[PDB]
Ligand binder design. Structure first.
Ligand SMILES: CSc1cc(-c2sc(-c3cccs3)nc2C)[nH]n1
Length: 184
């Protein structure tokens, strides 16, 4: 049902301009805040990578992977194929650390490029998400802005005392810059 979303993305997101670009980030970030609020996440990271991809990482429990009873498809796929961010992203990747394992799947405009598969072992838990906005949609600007992301990270941490939130800009490879907030 993400096919409508790439037709009238105005209800879902509101304006395809620069402010709609930065709202993708708060979508994913909301999820890690949930994991914090439930009592399992305490650490969260945001990076703007080269070519303006975006990476969010937390140490919560990891998205559920168990197979569902309606179609035999994993929980994590059923969930992402309903994601606004995923629909309006031209590429998107996910890594999950769960059951002592590292699972992985990868999309185009919300269409799964292959079945969830196992790619390693772990003794951690958590989720990683990387995505790259669909330019044919966000015509105007595909460049993120540090100050804007930075101000909002700072309010979120002050709103969630005890939780370490970090931002980093890796676009200028020779000059890497970082801020980390952790209110007692
Ligand atoms: C950074 S994206 C992300 C997604 C999630 C989780 S954790 C979860 C769980 C549901 C039930 C038990 S853990 N669901 C999602 C979507 N955390 N971080």
């Amino acid at each position: 049902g993400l096919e409508a979303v790439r037709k009238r993305p105005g209800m879902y997101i509101g304006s395809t301009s620069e402010r709609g670009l930065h709202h993708l980030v708060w979508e994913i970030v909301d999820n890690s805040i949930d994991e914090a609020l439930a009592g399992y996440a305490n650490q969260i990271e945001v990076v703007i990578e080269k070519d303006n991809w975006i990476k969010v990482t937390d140490n919560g429990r990891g998205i559920p992977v168990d197979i569902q009873e309606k179609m035999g498809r994993p929980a994590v796929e059923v969930i992402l194929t309903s994601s606004v961010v995923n629909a309006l992203s031209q590429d998107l990747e996910v890594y999950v650390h769960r059951n002592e394992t590292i699972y992985h799947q990868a999309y185009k405009k919300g269409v799964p490029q292959f079945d969830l598969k196992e790619v390693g072992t772990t003794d951690k838990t958590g989720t990683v998400i990387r995505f790259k906005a669909d330019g044919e949609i966000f015509t105007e600007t595909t460049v993120y802005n540090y100050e804007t992301l930075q101000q909002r990270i700072r309010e979120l941490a002050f709103l969630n005392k005890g939780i370490q939130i970090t931002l980093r800009d890796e676009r200028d490879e020779e000059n890497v810059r970082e801020d980390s907030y952790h209110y007692e």
